[PDB]
Design an enzyme around this catalytic site. Structure first.
Site, PDB file in Angstrom:
ATOM      1  N   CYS A   1      -7.567   3.927  10.557  1.00 11.71           N
ATOM      2  CA  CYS A   1      -6.594   3.120   9.839  1.00 11.71           C
ATOM      3  C   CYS A   1      -5.519   4.029   9.257  1.00 11.71           C
ATOM      4  O   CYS A   1      -5.776   5.182   8.901  1.00 11.71           O
ATOM      5  CB  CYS A   1      -7.268   2.316   8.727  1.00 11.71           C
ATOM      6  SG  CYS A   1      -7.984   3.312   7.400  1.00 11.71           S
TER       7      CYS A   1
ATOM      8  N   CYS B   1      -2.481   9.105   8.010  1.00 13.23           N
ATOM      9  CA  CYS B   1      -3.892   9.407   8.267  1.00 13.23           C
ATOM     10  C   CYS B   1      -4.248   9.689   9.730  1.00 13.23           C
ATOM     11  O   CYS B   1      -5.260  10.334  10.004  1.00 13.23           O
ATOM     12  CB  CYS B   1      -4.770   8.267   7.742  1.00 13.23           C
ATOM     13  SG  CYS B   1      -4.309   7.880   6.036  1.00 13.23           S
TER      14      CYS B   1
ATOM     15  N   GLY C   1      -1.804   4.443   6.778  1.00 14.61           N
ATOM     16  CA  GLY C   1      -0.920   3.912   5.761  1.00 14.61           C
ATOM     17  C   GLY C   1       0.329   3.302   6.368  1.00 14.61           C
ATOM     18  O   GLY C   1       0.774   3.674   7.454  1.00 14.61           O
TER      19      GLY C   1
ATOM     20  N   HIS D   1     -11.828  13.669   3.824  1.00 13.20           N
ATOM     21  CA  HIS D   1     -10.733  13.149   4.643  1.00 13.20           C
ATOM     22  C   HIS D   1      -9.509  14.031   4.432  1.00 13.20           C
ATOM     23  O   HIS D   1      -8.630  13.711   3.620  1.00 13.20           O
ATOM     24  CB  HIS D   1     -10.443  11.688   4.293  1.00 13.20           C
ATOM     25  CG  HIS D   1      -9.224  11.128   4.958  1.00 13.20           C
ATOM     26  ND1 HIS D   1      -8.831  11.492   6.227  1.00 13.20           N
ATOM     27  CD2 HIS D   1      -8.316  10.219   4.530  1.00 13.20           C
ATOM     28  CE1 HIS D   1      -7.730  10.837   6.551  1.00 13.20           C
ATOM     29  NE2 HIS D   1      -7.397  10.057   5.538  1.00 13.20           N
TER      30      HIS D   1
END
Lengths: 728, 395, 394
Positions: C380, C91, C382, C350
């Site tokens: 944040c 991300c 993964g 996103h």
């Protein structure tokens, strides 16, 4: 979301008939022409009809799409497509999106739709049939099926690309149907899958269509009216671009396409392949929309306008007797007499006998005349092993060629075509010994390429029937005939040679008498520019690459070896004397020193075993290694685009001179003549269209052409200066 | 500001493609095995001071997808604060990971960065990730894509390298790779691969054919539409002389490599001794149709940037993708023969795409200390016509 | 070292996943379209000074494989010396490209770097690349992989965020995003996508549902990993599944670019810096909960830049799940008026590899519009990672 073009007038094209069983028969019958065309009237008519199919869906069980014309449906509105400016891309997109919105509704109606193809189904017409669930074709003479949009610089934008890929896969649809616009006879169309079944006569089509609907509703109740790509579990033939088998060779398809086009700037096949691959990566609706954007990209482009102008408007105006004299009627041809059994005379005898004409092939010896007929036997042999003709039609074709060596066997000949060596007094003797044996109304034709027709006509007494009939080698594969009109040549003889040209399956252009005519004169400037660049020190590989990447069928140095440098020097000696009589002599082209330097070294062309290329066992094998040391190759490295423009502009500027002097009477003859005669690249639309459709750094149009011509004139010589007629 | 140093550089042996020893070993295991070796060499290192892990991988799909660098961090029990990022600059991905690590350390926002690459080509062949250019015929028609095999033959054609010339270099690479193994050069850097029971899987570079003769290289056969597409751009060339075979081109193998990079203060805090210093990096490129001429401008750039010349460099290491690429490189910059790929190269030992850059980097680190030499320049030709060069200095 | 500056930051609109406007657009085209817009805004820039092009991409397969960064260089006719490298840090891939570009500039061995990201999740869905962890069960058994949605539900359970709590944040994200589009905030930075004919394809973030209501969000339904998560978090009895499709990030297509260079590189090209990269950081947390990584990354980037929470004017955290933002807000006591002030991925989407560059460019524009000084951008990640970046308006 509408089936009509405008959300905010022309005559109806489609007739509506619903029978007692609920089968609707849509019969396309445009009352403003002889052929159903995808014009504004059709779009509105099919819009009304499709709306009605949805409004009356409860009382409808099947649909049959038929036609009342001799053809099923052939053509789009080229008059409208050629006027589409780049600012009109919004309208072009919306139009093809509306067309395919109608066909997608007809395709997902929940009931079977059958195409009753009674004749030619070309382009948009096949796209209509491809939207049906079943296609029945009548096996009539003259019927063809295919998507020839690419031959006009376009792409099948009414769903042709999207559906052929869903039916056959990316590779098969592109190679067999899309990339070359191949036309298929009804028998071959069923063999590849474009048509599902055939009937003998057009009268059985609608009964067979309604019968298939009845049987489909009973045998396949759940799959009726559902295409293969709308069923769950559909698998595209050959795989999708993400399939491992296809993803290996898929990045090599653009390189194969660039090799076949030899780097030419024809964008239509690039877009078709792009639309095909991009479409196979998404759903059908998204794929169809991608196809619309590529179509709008082509139609608003310039190359499409060049090819539409040449291969639709110009070619039709020619086939409609544009250069044929008015008032003159038809005159039959019963016995054709060919003087000379060289490669030219042999090819003339073949294309004439293939059309049904009786040919008497004469030469100085019976041994020679028989070898000329062997040219036709070898062509029929290759045609028999490939299965394109029958054994009975091949025996009847050769039976019409009668080789001989006696002038008495020209009795009953009413159409003479001389194909002897290029020499005036030789042609005078050959005509003198047969002009009183042939019929008194016989055409006296001369396959001469440079010698003026008026001079050759003095050797006969019936000068009104003397005329130039210029063919191109190989005659069995070259589509043009250059008809040169002498001063005493009558309009009747002109029309009789015109009709002969169409009868043998070729395209004629009418040319007034002048040295070099049009084809020999213009192709000479093309060859001369290459030889000049070789003398200037340019790499021979770069010259040949410039020729292929410009779009020519054969590179210039390869062509020079086939035209014979010996004969090329004789044209320099001949044109020397003509201009010396006027004044200022003539400025010898820089290529002339290159031709002499090659003859002095004993390399005259492919005929003499050696030229710019080395020839071993007939097949051409590499450039002459001593060529670089002879002309100091490598010392001059101009841009490749300058080599290309020098060859294209020289021919274009020479074409404009022919139009000014009166050698040609129309730009249609100029474009089709340059394309079909000497091999001017098709993306240009012809050596005359090239001027009004030029595109580059300077811009686009006649003004940009003049600018680039002057840019070339400052660098490479004032022969590239534009004539007064192009200035404005 | 901060200077970047190399503290350790190790690599796995390179297992061949057909019946390879490493074919049963997942690429993640190859990386984890090297991380464990670093732990055996320096067990008291504070792994929390490792701020990132950068791995090059050219085909990040399947066993190599999903950010294989972060997987190595979690699977090896490294701290969760140690990052993990995969990058792909084709052939130079291994060296690009090292260069990026060095640049991150110089910026002062990373302390200790582990770099390297991994490529299991027998399990994930090249091309497995597809490609935005192969699936876009609208632009692939214009970039004029040609396989790097033909670009190598074109270089041999233009520069005049005969079939015997490229085969002679292939023989030298085999001879120097064999002499390096037998001499113990690779003893401390090549980490044998073992299974979960400790059993040996591979401890040498399988792709080597040390019994190669020049007469056998001449018996080999050289490797639609690509030849005519290349000549459309290089129009002054009539025909391409096809000289490159499987004996003078890089081998397809599996392998992984690791390089530990950090500042001087980072090493002093962990009791580490710097082995070499990253002097300068540079990325450039040349024509992508010939696709393999990027090394020359990238090497020229990294020399000007560090204020050095060819006479200042002791060892030159260029990846042996094809023999003509190295011969062209040697001819352009006039490299002496005794300085170029002194321990053999990918022709003998293989070219595991994403890992090669880190392998040949660690190879020069060891040879500089073994010869007690000072400077080495490492470079690789890249797909798409790119070039990466790096200058290291022994400390 | 040598300071790194942001000179431009633009992005495409974000097209939705189901029947989306950008589904027919290749991800390579989304990037080339943004490159062409940069040429339109600065035609006289010497592109030969662009030394590298760094693009983030999480699923680099198919239309996104084969180093899409290099493909953009060649397809858009950029100089052949401009490089091109793809990186994947899940991300945060978009922000990692910007951070790496900035650090390459600070090293001195790069002059002008083009950073950004691309992700066409309607064409290359999440997970298309497989995964070294998901295909090795022997070690996938010890890492105890748990998808992102259960970690977010676990966060809401531990911190005590109710179903109404996370849906209340989802409402203000839709509201603030609608106010930003209506106010014209995104006029300069969202470059509409057009076809090869110039026809419009998309000019707005079509995932937005601006008529969202509190009652409507309460009707949505929530999404053996639950057992596995509670095996590590053994003091937790039941996981309260509170996250739906209305309070989670949206699956969209999009791309973004950020031009980064030194002060010397800008003055040589006549460019004016818009903001300055003050500091970057990379940390992490537990890989079972995954989404608690932005908290230590923000604390580290503040410690590295010599700043505190009170020194930051705008906080931008990717709205992967509402509970992640609420915990980040609770951990550092972030005031509501400074957190995702123009909405987030719940409203606009996103697009994985591009989100980091999109939300960074969002803060460059809002700092200028508000005439504020500093902004902190964090995502944040993964696998339990975190990335944070501090910029200062210039």
């Amino acid at each position: 979301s509408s089936h009509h073009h405008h959300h905010h007038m022309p005559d109806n094209t489609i007739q509506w008939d619903k029978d007692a069983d609920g089968i609707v028969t849509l019969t396309m019958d445009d009352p403003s022409g002889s052929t159903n065309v995808m014009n504004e009237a059709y779009i509105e008519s099919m819009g009304k009809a499709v709306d009605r199919l949805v409004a009356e869906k409860d009382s409808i069980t099947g649909v049959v799409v038929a036609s009342a014309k001799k053809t099923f449906f052939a053509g789009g509105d080229v008059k409208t497509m050629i006027q589409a400016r780049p600012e009109d891309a919004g309208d072009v997109f919306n139009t093809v999106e509306t067309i395919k919105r109608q066909l997608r509704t007809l395709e997902t109606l929940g009931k079977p739709v059958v195409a009753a193809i009674n004749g030619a189904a070309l382009g948009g017409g096949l796209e209509i049939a491809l939207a049906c669930h079943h296609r029945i074709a009548a096996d009539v003479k003259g019927s063809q099926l295919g998507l020839p949009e690419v031959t006009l610089g376009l792409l099948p934008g009414g769903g042709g690309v999207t559906r052929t890929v869903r039916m056959f896969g990316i590779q098969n649809a592109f190679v067999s149907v899309l990339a070359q616009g191949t036309r298929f006879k009804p028998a071959k169309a069923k063999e590849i899958g474009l048509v599902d079944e055939l009937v003998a006569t057009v009268e059985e089509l609608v009964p067979a269509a309604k019968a298939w609907i009845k049987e489909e509703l009973k045998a396949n109740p759940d799959g009726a009216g559902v295409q293969p790509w709308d069923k769950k579990g559909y698998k595209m033939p050959g795989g999708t671009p993400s399939s491992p088998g296809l993803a290996a060779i898929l990045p090599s398809f653009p390189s194969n396409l660039r090799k076949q086009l030899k780097g030419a700037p024809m964008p239509a096949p690039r877009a078709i392949l792009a639309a095909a691959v991009e479409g196979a990566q998404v759903d059908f609706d998204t794929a169809s929309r991608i196809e619309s954007r590529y179509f709008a990209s082509l139609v608003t482009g310039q190359v499409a306008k060049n090819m539409m102008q040449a291969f639709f408007f110009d070619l039709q105006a020619i086939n409609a007797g544009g250069s044929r004299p008015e008032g003159i009627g038809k005159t039959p041809i019963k016995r054709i007499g060919v003087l000379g059994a060289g490669m030219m005379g042999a090819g003339i005898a073949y294309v004439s006998a293939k059309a049904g004409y009786e040919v008497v092939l004469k030469d100085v010896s019976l041994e020679a005349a028989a070898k000329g007929k062997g040219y036709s036997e070898k062509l029929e042999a290759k045609a028999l092993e490939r299965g394109r003709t029958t054994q009975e039609r091949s025996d009847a074709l050769l039976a019409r060629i009668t080789p001989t060596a006696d002038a008495a066997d020209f009795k009953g000949v009413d159409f003479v075509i001389e194909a002897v060596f290029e020499n005036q007094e030789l042609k005078h003797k050959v005509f003198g010994e047969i002009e009183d044996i042939v019929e008194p109304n016989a055409i006296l034709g001369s396959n001469t390429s440079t010698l003026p027709i008026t001079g050759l006509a003095t050797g006969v007494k019936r000068q009104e029937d003397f005329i130039g009939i210029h063919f191109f080698s190989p005659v069995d594969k070259m589509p043009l005939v250059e008809i040169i009109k002498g001063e005493k040549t009558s309009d009747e003889a002109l029309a009789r040679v015109f009709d002969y040209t169409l009868a043998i399956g070729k395209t004629p252009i009418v040319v007034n008498d002048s040295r070099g005519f049009f084809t020999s004169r213009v192709i000479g400037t093309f060859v001369n520019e290459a030889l000049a660049m070789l003398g200037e020190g340019v790499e021979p590989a770069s010259i040949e690459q410039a020729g292929s990447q410009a779009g020519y069928p054969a590179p210039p140095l390869q062509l020079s070896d086939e035209l014979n440098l010996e004969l090329m020097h004789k044209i320099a000696v001949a044109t020397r004397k003509g201009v010396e009589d006027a004044g200022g002599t003539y400025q010898p082209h820089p290529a002339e020193a290159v031709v002499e330097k090659m003859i002095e070294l004993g390399r005259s062309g492919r005929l003499k075993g050696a030229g710019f290329y080395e020839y071993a066992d007939g097949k051409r094998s590499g450039l002459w290694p001593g060529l670089r040391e002879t002309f100091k190759s490598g010392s001059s490295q101009p841009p490749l685009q300058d080599m290309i423009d020098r060859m294209l502009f020289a021919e274009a500027l020479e074409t404009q001179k022919c139009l000014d002097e009166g050698v040609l009477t129309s730009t249609a003859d100029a474009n089709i003549g340059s394309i079909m005669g000497i091999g001017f690249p098709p993306w240009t639309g012809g050596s005359a269209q090239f001027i009004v459709g030029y595109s580059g750094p300077a811009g686009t149009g006649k003004a940009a052409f003049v600018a680039r011509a002057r840019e070339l004139a400052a660098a490479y010589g004032d022969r590239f200066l534009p004539p007064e007629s192009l200035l404005s | 500001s901060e200077e970047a140093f190399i503290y350790e550089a190790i690599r796995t042996p390179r297992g061949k493609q057909k019946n390879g020893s490493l074919h049963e070993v997942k690429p993640l295991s190859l990386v984890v095995g090297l991380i464990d070796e670093l732990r055996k060499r320096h067990p008291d290192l504070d792994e929390n001071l490792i701020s990132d892990v950068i791995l090059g991988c050219v085909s990040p799909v399947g066993d190599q997808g999903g950010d294989i660098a972060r997987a190595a961090v979690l699977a090896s029990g490294m701290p969760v604060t140690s990052g993990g990022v995969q990058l792909n600059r084709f052939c130079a991905s291994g060296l690009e990971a090292v260069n990026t690590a060095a640049q991150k350390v110089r910026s002062g926002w990373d302390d200790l960065v582990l770099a390297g690459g991994v490529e299991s080509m027998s399990r994930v062949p090249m091309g497995s990730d597809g490609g935005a250019m192969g699936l876009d015929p609208a632009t692939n028609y214009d970039v004029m894509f040609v396989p790097q095999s033909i670009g190598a033959d074109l270089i041999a054609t233009i520069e005049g390298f005969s079939r015997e010339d490229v085969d002679a270099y292939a023989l030298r690479s085999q001879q120097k790779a064999a002499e390096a193994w037998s001499g113990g050069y690779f003893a401390k850097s090549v980490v044998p691969v073992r299974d979960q029971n400790g059993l040996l899987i591979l401890d040498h570079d399988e792709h080597m054919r040390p019994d190669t003769t020049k007469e056998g290289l001449a018996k080999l056969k050289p490797a639609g539409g690509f030849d005519d597409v290349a000549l459309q751009k290089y129009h002054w060339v009539e025909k391409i002389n096809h000289v490159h075979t499987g004996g003078n081109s890089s081998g397809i193998v599996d392998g992984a490599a690791l390089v530990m990079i950090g500042s001087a203060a980072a090493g002093k805090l962990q009791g580490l001794t710097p082995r070499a210093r990253i002097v300068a990096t540079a990325t450039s490129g040349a024509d992508p149709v010939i696709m393999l001429t990027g090394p020359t401008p990238a090497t020229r750039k990294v020399l000007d940037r560090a204020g050095l010349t060819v006479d200042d460099i002791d060892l030159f290491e260029l990846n042996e993708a094809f023999a003509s690429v190295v011969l062209k490189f040697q001819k352009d910059l006039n490299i002496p023969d005794e300085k170029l790929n002194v321990n053999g190269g990918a022709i003998a030992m293989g070219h595991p795409l994403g890992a090669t850059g880190a392998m040949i980097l660690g190879t020069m680190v060891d040879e500089l200390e073994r010869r007690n030499a000072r400077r080495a320049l490492i470079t690789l030709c890249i797909g798409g016509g790119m070039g990466v060069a790096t200058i290291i200095e022994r400390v």
